[PDB]
Paper text:
pmcRyanodine receptors (RyRs) are intracellular calcium channels involved in the excitation–contraction coupling in muscle cells and in calcium signaling in neurons and other cell types. Caffeine, a xanthine derivative found in plants, has been used for decades as a pharmacologic research tool for activating RyRs, and its functional and binding properties have been extensively described. Mechanistically, caffeine stabilizes the C-terminal domain (CTD) which is responsible for transducing the Ca2+ binding signal to the S6 pore helix, leading to gating. Here, using cryo-EM, we explore multiple xanthine derivatives and related compounds and identify 4-oxopyrimidine/2-pyridone as the minimal motif necessary for binding to the xanthine/caffeine binding site in RyRs.
To determine the minimal motif necessary for binding to the xanthine/caffeine binding site and how different substitutions affect the coordination mode, we resolved the cryo-EM structure of RyR1 in the presence of different xanthine derivates. We found a clear cryo-EM density in the xanthine/caffeine site for pentoxifylline, dyphylline, IBMX, and enprofylline, while we found no density for xanthosine. We were able to model the most likely position of the xanthine derivates thanks to the clear additional densities from the substituent groups and found the xanthine scaffold in a similar orientation in all four samples, stacked on RyR1–Trp4716. Second, we found that RyR1–Tyr5014 was not engaged when N1 was methylated or substituted (IBMX and pentoxifylline) but it was engaged when N1 was unmodified or protonated (enprofylline). Additionally, for pentoxifylline, we observed that the carbonyl C2=O interacts with the backbone carbonyl of residue RyR1–Glu4239 through a water molecule for xanthine and caffeine. Surprisingly, oxopyricid led to more RyR1 particles in the open state (70% particles in the open state) than the other water-soluble compounds (5% for pentoxifylline, 15% for dyphylline, and 20 to 30% for caffeine). We observed that 1 mM caffeine, pentoxifylline, dyphylline, oxypurinol, and oxopyricid all had similar effects on the Ca2+-dependent ryanodine binding of RyR1.
Author numbering:
A (entry chain B): 244 to 630
B (entry chain B): 3634 to 3736, 3749 to 4020
C (entry chain F): 1 to 107
D (entry chain B): 1648 to 1874, 1922 to 2046, 2088 to 2397, 2410 to 2567
Write the structure that this text describes.
């Protein structure tokens, strides 16, 4: 469904759209009033379309058939459509400007005009900023739409989110297929998982989210930090974080690569550990330095602590927890004795690591504020034993 | 009440001492003038022994003033949700702004000499990144009015006074190479915040002054509150004077940059924003004139409020004039297609009627003169 | 309870009386052998008046049996001592306490 | 092992350093209990040995230094630094002796500065408090959060300071030798810890005059000689060491400023004594010479007629010498002030050799030379050095900014002022840490102690200078923000935070204005207050606005719009705690609506008169959002106000509608009472918004419009019906056991009083027939009821008292008005 909305959605990716002219050649030509085209949602990959059953919607490419998905930009609602323009080679005249032209979107076949539905009862009571978009014969003055540029970084991020979501959902589906089915003394007999693609995507995304070097000059480093924060926020809003968590859970159900192999096979078992480590690293990269993304774990902190004992990705899980604790006071407030004891047990079981001490230190104080309960719990649990 | 007003000798000692503290502070310390800005700037500008090393010429290490400018630019560039107030930045910006200007017939020789001295004093700053720091702080404020942005604007005006082409070029080059929308977004937000005459606030202040209740502490008759009507007039004049100075000298490049920013993903038209503020001010002035229309004689507070409004409108007119002068044809066309005509119509109406009214009473001659100069 | 074993003898004639301040040096160890307190490290003798309840029962009764110049080892069960609640950070719950106490003087 | 083996054993070194870091974290920010616990794991002997140990690695050395500071010194230094900004100077002979410059041959203006940090300081700083570390002590039986807060562990300060001086001197001497085996492996690891300890001790006030002199000589002997070895400033140092030097110089500049303030206070004492004597003599002269000339005599008396502050200002207004003659004071008294002013200007350096010869010159040259010698890579050091430079260049402005925080008190008030200072120190400490039950008990105890203290009443300007109300607001709002959405934490502490702020506004207008300035922010946090029982930030705002026409007129629109939006939301949905408790679901929240309505009442109506400026706006906003009016008065499909009251009475009678009907507090909400109170408050607000008679008479169109709008909203018949509505009355039955109505669940006379006010201000009573109608229907029955209740059993009943108040307040005055 399509809505008019205001707020952070303007910064977000899901408000992004791509214009695709029908002609393949010179598709990058200057847009022209009355030019038929298709409107694609970058992240989902879906195309704006008119469907008899649900009117204005976004549909898949397979369903798109150039009559539902064909739209044109019109300077004025008055419609003559006496002569269709001829196909033109080259870039052509620069008719439509960014941020200046007022454009009405018209569905070519029906001739209907894109417009807001108008509030349904109790919507005005809520005051919600969402106004469903419809195709209507008359519409209103206000229907005119400005077109605004999108940064290359953000467009690339939207496309990357589309591809990553598709790949990771396919991977999750492959896992769920044999979740409860042991292959036995035989193959799993299901579609091969995309292990190499997942590994490469994780590596590329980690490099994508890598923080700027400390040796870097201050202004450039600040610019990189901004870009990184915006990119983290976009991925989070489109839900890649939750997808990573789901993949991690599906992989965690299996204790070891052999236990994984009994369900998926050795050829995936070798990459199991690499994939879990890469997933934890990607999670840490996404949430590192991001207050909101680190705060999200207030709802599920047990998700991180429960997994600390696991050997395969101990360091990655610990880094994730360290990032969360440095960033989010909320987590500190919701800490409990069970979590503190689990971390102390991590010291006992995995040896003397100063990173655990740094985690404990972060628990005590955040941004000039001390948590007395956490301080006292750490003291009472760790110190008196003296071992 | 006066009988109860005790002679100070009856007053307890500690209360009297505190009263003496406030009185001495106001009468003596504030009245005392001490100028350390020029000396401080010279001391910081001087770099010592670098010629003695003779490698410092190849190295070009910053001088102390350059380092301070770099520190403030670092603070501005630092990524933050909000710009925290820095009394240090405020004080140092005041010091530099003072140093630059450091201000009945004058010879051409003399005028040229003062121009040259001001250019040197401005060079002390803009050779050391002061212009870039000013732009960075305006971008950092993100449209929130404050003492920080006031000091930044004052510094910019101080370095730009006389239409310094070199400062203009530095600012424009920095903006074009950075390609950041935050600067003009902040300017637009600041204009939107800039206030106009409010008849309700004027009436409330009049009621308060009329009451003039005695304060329980001591006695304060007719107590006065901070000016409600157009309190940010100094900030408004500073902002529009900064914008004017940027285009001063018929700098077509910066004029066209204000109209549109080609490289940037989004564009803001400062000329149209100025026109909108002028229209709002004109509406306020028209309403306030209507309020005083039946009344035979405007009172003193009304005269002061008119004077503030007309000074602001004068600065706005000068800024628009400076945008279009040179001439800049694009700015001319934009204004021709803007609402400036409606603003001029309202201003002419107010001018005519207030002229006729003010002519009637001689005490209103100064306000009439200001009105005529505004026309 | 309190078990007292003489490390070094005292005078054998002077014993603390109620309302009489006892000045001591002590070194505090848990039964495992870990030291948690010592007045000698601070270099300042610890003074406590008998019968106020400033110190734990173990100290009260054990010093009651001691004499001037006497050095003794006092073993105090948790019941005498801080007990199940313990002394957070310092002493675990249900910890027997071993003290090396020298009764320097009475005042 | 020997801990020195960690030089080669690096992993253990990192682990132990981070262990010390953890110790510091757990004892951080006032956890004195944890500090006492840590005293066992790391003892005083260990810490001192580490301080003196040359062979330790730098991480461990610095960690042990910082651990010592955290356990023993950090909290004390924090409290002292918090107090240092203020300058409360008692009037004593010690204060009197203070002079800008120290006695000598040279003239005060040209006469050489005294050494910083040396002399007499009379400003009040609360003493430090420490507790010995003992682990054999009896465990308090009292439960946690009730026991008094533990003090920081004790450390022998005289030994520590002597040791710090000796170690700093040895470090200076060895740095002079430029040896290749520095303590900690670096000049930084050597110098930084000692300097931090010394600065902490200075701020804490441990060092005396002679040791301050020793430190000053270590810094620079030539400048600080009083009437070879190389000083730290000349040594050549890394940036961190320079930063510690900057902190020390900061302290000494603070001391110079404090000395200036104290000297000014002493001069004020002496000068005020002289001026008071002279003024007394002059008024004796006047009382003798009134016979000579009446007019000039009266003109001179005008002085004594002026308030004392004006008299002082007039007497001091003789600087320009143009107003010299008008000032009555003699030339000698004037000259004393002139000489003091010149001496103060000289002290600040305003009056204008290579060798510095002064702290200001030393600091300025040192900063400039550092910047010239190297491009500083530490922004913290850059900020510190340039800030200190600014102070040296403009001391006088620094004094100007410090003066508002200077206050003079009699020595008699010293003990109470110190108690207040302690309480304020605890409150300030509470800011940094997250709130818990113990911190709440402490905050409440401190607030109660402050209220008990007289200085809180006698010296409100001192409280405003101290910024104590702002601290209370910050604590309150942090607690409201924490768990804001889910449910309100520490309602008791928030209630105390009003009682304090709300009383503080009551004390003085200037306090009320100061809280008015933050009004909006209080209103931003108010949203939860509707659910909140007891005092709330909305009540704080009401105190800020109450009975001050100036503040009411200064009040800005957007605040009223925000209140009206909250009120609408109350009219639109129900509160989620009543549903959680099981209360029957309804559309709207009458309780929160009532809260916002009485706030608007206090805003609009002041001292017996309506403020039309706010009232007209309130009416416009309410008509724009008619949900505030209630589901009754809705318009389409809306039951009238009288029917709403009747339905509320039926609900009150019927349980499962008043409440869940499945209360230790007994304040449990009763829906009928809540609805009736909401409507009564709305009617009262509208009647108060109603224009005044004299405006009506003048014929002002806006006033007529407002009255017509109010009349359209509320018809007269509904008001008369509500006034006629019966009120339950106490009776005796079944052995005479008093059957007495429950007020919180029943219709009450105040509900009728609101309607009476509306009728008087809006509709009025002009005709005998209507007056008689009202009397027969509603008033006379209630008066008869009150009189009948005027018996021994019933006289003190709550209903009888309510009826008497309702009558005297609303009805009887109206009958007196309509008597003709």
């Amino acid at each position: 469904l399509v809505y008019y909305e205001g707020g952070a959605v303007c910064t977000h990716a899901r408000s992004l759209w791509r214009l695709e002219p029908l002609r393949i050649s010179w598709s990058g030509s200057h847009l022209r009033w009355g030019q038929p085209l298709r409107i694609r949602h970058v992240t989902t990959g879906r195309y704006l379309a008119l469907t008899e059953d649900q009117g204005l919607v976004v549909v898949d490419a397979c369903k798109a058939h150039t009559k539902a998905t064909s739209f044109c930009f019109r300077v004025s609602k008055e419609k003559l459509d006496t002569a269709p323009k001829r196909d033109v080679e080259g870039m052509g005249p620069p008719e439509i400007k960014y941020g200046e032209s007022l454009c009405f979107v018209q569905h070519v076949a029906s001739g209907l005009w894109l417009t807001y539905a108008a509030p349904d009862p109790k919507a005005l009571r809520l005051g919600v900023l969402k106004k469903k978009a419809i195709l209507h014969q008359e519409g209103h003055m206000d229907d005119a739409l400005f077109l605004t540029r999108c940064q290359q970084e953000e467009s690339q991020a939207a496309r990357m989110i589309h591809s990553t979501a598709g790949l990771y959902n396919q991977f999750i589906k492959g896992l769920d297929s044999f979740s409860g089915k042991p292959r036995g003394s035989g193959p799993p007999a299901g579609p091969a998982l995309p292990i190499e693609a997942v590994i490469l995507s994780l590596q590329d995304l980690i490099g994508y989210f890598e923080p700027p070097s400390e040796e870097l000059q201050h202004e450039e480093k600040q610019s990189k930090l901004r870009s990184l924060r915006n990119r983290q926020s976009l991925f989070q809003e489109e839900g890649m974080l939750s997808l990573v968590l789901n993949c991690i859970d599906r992989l965690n159900v299996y204790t070891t690569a052999a236990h994984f192999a009994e369900y998926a096979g050795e050829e995936a078992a070798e990459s199991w550990k690499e994939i879990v480590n890469l997933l934890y690293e990607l999670l840490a990269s996404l949430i590192r330095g991001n207050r909101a993304n680190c705060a999200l774990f207030s709802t599920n902190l047990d998700w991180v602590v429960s997994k600390l004992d696991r050997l395969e990705a101990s360091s990655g899980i610990l880094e994730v927890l360290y990032c969360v604790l440095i960033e989010s006071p909320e987590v500190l407030n919701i800490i409990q004795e069970n979590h503190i004891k689990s971390i102390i047990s991590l010291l006992d079981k995995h040896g003397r690591n100063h990173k655990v001490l740094d985690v404990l230190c972060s628990l005590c104080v955040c941004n000039g504020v001390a948590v007395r309960s956490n301080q006292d719990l750490i003291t009472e649990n760790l110190l008196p034993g003296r071992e | 009440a006066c009988f109860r007003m005790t002679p100070l000798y009856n007053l307890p000692t500690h209360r009297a001492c505190n009263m003496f503290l406030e009185s001495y502070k106001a009468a003596w310390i504030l009245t005392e003038d001490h100028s350390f800005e020029d000396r401080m700037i010279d001391d910081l500008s001087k770099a010592g022994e670098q010629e003695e090393e003779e490698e410092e010429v190849e190295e070009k290490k910053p001088d102390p003033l350059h380092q301070l400018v770099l520190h403030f630019s670092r603070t501005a560039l630092t990524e933050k949700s909000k710009l925290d107030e820095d009394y240090l930045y405020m004080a140092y910006a005041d010091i530099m702004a003072k140093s630059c200007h450091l201000e009945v017939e004058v010879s051409f020789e003399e005028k040229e000499m003062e121009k040259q001295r001001l250019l040197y004093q401005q060079s002390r700053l803009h050779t050391r990144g002061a212009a870039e720091m000013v732009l960075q702080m305006i971008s950092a404020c993100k449209g929130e009015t404050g003492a920080m942005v006031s000091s930044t604007l004052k510094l910019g005006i101080s370095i730009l006074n006389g239409g310094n082409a070199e400062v203009q070029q530095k600012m424009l080059d920095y903006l074009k190479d950075k390609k950041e929308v935050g600067f003009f977004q902040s300017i637009q937000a600041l204009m939107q915040t800039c206030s106009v005459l409010d008849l309700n606030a004027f009436e409330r202040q009049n009621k308060a002054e009329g009451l003039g209740m005695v304060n329980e502490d001591g006695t304060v008759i007719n107590r006065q509150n901070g000016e409600k009507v157009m309190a940010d007039d100094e900030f408004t004049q500073d902002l529009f004077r900064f914008l004017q100075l940027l285009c001063e000298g018929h700098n077509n490049d910066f004029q066209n940059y204000l109209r549109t920013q080609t490289g940037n993903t989004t564009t803001i038209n400062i000329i149209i924003c100025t026109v909108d503020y002028l229209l709002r001010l004109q509406e306020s002035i028209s309403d306030f004139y209507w309020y005083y229309s039946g009344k035979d004689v405007i009172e003193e507070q009304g005269k002061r409020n008119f004077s503030k409004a007309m000074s602001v409108a004068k600065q706005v007119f000068n800024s628009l004039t400076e945008y279009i002068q040179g001439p800049c044809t694009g700015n001319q066309q934009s204004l021709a297609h803007s609402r400036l005509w409606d603003a001029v119509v309202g201003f002419l109406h107010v001018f005519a009627h207030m002229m006729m009214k003010l002519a009637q009473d001689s005490s209103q001659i100064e306000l009439l003169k200001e009105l005529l100069d505004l026309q | 309870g309190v078990q007292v074993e003489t490390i070094s003898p005292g005078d054998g004639r002077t014993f603390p009386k109620r309302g009489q301040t006892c000045v001591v040096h002590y070194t505090g160890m848990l039964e495992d052998g870990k030291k948690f307190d010592s007045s000698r490290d601070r270099n300042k003798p610890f003074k406590f008046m008998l019968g106020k309840q400033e110190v734990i029962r173990g100290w009260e009764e054990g010093v009651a049996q001691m004499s001037v110049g006497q050095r003794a080892k006092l073993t105090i069960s948790p019941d005498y001592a801080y007990g199940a609640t313990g002394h957070p950070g310092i002493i675990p719950p249900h910890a027997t306490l071993v003290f090396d106490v020298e009764l320097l003087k009475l005042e | 092992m020997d801990i020195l083996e960690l030089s080669e054993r690096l992993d253990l070194q990192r682990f132990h350093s981070h262990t010390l870091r953890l110790y510091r974290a757990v004892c951080a920010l006032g956890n004195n209990r944890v500090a006492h616990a840590l005293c066992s794991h790391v003892d005083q002997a260990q810490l001192l040995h580490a301080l003196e140990d040359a062979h330790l690695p730098g991480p461990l050395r610095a960690g042990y230094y910082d651990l010592l500071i955290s356990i023993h010194l950090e909290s004390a230094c924090r409290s002292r630094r918090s107090m240092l900004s203020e300058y409360i100077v008692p009037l004593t002979p010690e204060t009197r002796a203070i002079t800008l410059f120290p006695p000598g041959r040279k003239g005060g203006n040209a006469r050489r500065h005294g050494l910083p940090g040396v002399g007499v300081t009379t400003s009040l700083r609360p003493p430090h408090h420490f507790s010995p570390p003992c682990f054999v002590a009896a465990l308090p039986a009292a439960g946690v959060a009730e026991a008094p807060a533990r003090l920081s562990p004790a450390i022998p300060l005289e030994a520590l300071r002597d040791k710090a001086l000796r170690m700093l001197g040895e470090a200076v001497r060895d740095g002079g030798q430029h040896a290749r085996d520095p303590v900690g492996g670096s000049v930084e690891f050597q110098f930084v810890p000692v300097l931090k300890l010394v600065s902490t001790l200075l701020v804490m006030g441990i060092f005396g005059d002679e040791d301050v002199k020793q430190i000053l000589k270590m810094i620079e002997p030539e400048v600080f000689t009083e009437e070879l070895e190389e000083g730290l400033l000349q040594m050549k140092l890394p940036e961190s060491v320079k930063l510690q030097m900057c902190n020390l110089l900061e302290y000494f500049c603070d001391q110079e400023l404090q000395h200036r303030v104290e000297s000014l206070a002493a001069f004020a004492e002496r000068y005020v004594d002289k001026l008071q004597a002279n003024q007394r003599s002059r008024y004796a002269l006047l009382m003798r010479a009134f016979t000579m000339s009446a007019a000039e005599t009266a003109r001179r008396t005008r002085e004594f007629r002026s308030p004392p502050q004006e008299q002082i200002n007039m007497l001091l207004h003789f600087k320009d010498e143009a107003d010299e003659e008008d000032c009555p004071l003699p030339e000698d008294i004037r000259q004393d002030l002139q000489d003091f002013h010149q001496d103060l200007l000289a002290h600040c350096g305003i009056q204008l050799e290579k060798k510095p010869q002064s702290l200001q010159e030393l600091v300025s040259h040192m900063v400039v030379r550092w910047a010239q010698e190297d491009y500083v890579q530490s922004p913290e050091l850059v900020r510190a050095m340039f800030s200190l430079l600014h102070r040296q260049y403009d001391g006088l402005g620094e004094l100007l900014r410090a003066l508002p925080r200077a206050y003079t008190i009699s020595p008699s008030s010293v003990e109470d002022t110190m108690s207040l200072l302690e309480c304020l120190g605890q409150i300030r400490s509470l800011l940094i840490v997250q709130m818990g039950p113990q911190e709440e008990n402490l905050m409440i105890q401190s607030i109660g102690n402050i209220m008990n203290n007289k200085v809180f009443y006698q010296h409100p300007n001192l409280m405003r200078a101290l910024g104590m109300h702002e601290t209370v607001m910050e604590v309150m709002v942090n607690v409201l923000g924490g768990g804001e959405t889910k449910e309100i934490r520490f309602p008791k502490m928030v209630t105390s935070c009003c009682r304090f702020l709300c009383y503080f506004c009551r004390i003085s207008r200037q306090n009320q204005r100061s809280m008015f300035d933050h009004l909006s922010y209080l209103l931003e946090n108010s949203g939860i207050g509707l659910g909140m029982q007891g005092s709330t930030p909305l009540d704080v705002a009401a105190a800020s606005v109450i009975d001050n026409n100036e503040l009411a007129l200064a009040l800005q629109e957007q605040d009223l719009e925000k209140v009206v939006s909250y009120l609408a939301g109350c009219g639109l949905q129900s509160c989620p705690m009543l549903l959680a408790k099981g209360y029957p679901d309804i559309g709207w929240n009458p309780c929160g609506g009532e809260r916002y309505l009485d706030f608007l009442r206090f805003a609009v109506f002041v001292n017996g008169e309506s403020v039309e400026e706010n009232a007209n706006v309130v009416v416009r906003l309410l008509i724009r959002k008619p949900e505030c009016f209630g589901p009754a008065l809705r318009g389409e499909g809306g039951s009238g106000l009288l029917a709403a009251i009747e339905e509320a009475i039926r609900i009150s009678e019927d349980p499962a509608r008043d409440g869940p009907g499945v209360p230790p507090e007994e304040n449990r909400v009763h829906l009928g009472h809540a609805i009736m109170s909401f409507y009564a408050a709305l009617i009262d607000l509208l009647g108060r918004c109603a224009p005044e008679m004299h405006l009506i008479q003048a014929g002002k169109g806006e006033a007529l419009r407002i009255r017509a709008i109010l009349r359209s909203l509320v018809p007269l018949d509904d008001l008369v019906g509500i006034i006629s509505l019966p009120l339950q009355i106490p009776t005796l039955g079944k052995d005479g056991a008093l059957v007495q109505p429950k007020m919180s669940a029943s219709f009450v006379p105040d509900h009728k009083a609101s309607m009476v006010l509306f009728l008087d201000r809006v509709y009025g009573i002009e005709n005998q027939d209507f007056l008689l109608h009202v009397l027969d229907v509603g008033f006379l029955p209630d008066m008869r009821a009150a009189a009948s209740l005027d018996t021994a059993t019933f006289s003190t009943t709550e209903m009888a008292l309510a009826l008497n108040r309702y009558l005297c307040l609303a009805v009887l005055p109206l009958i007196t008005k309509c008597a003709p």
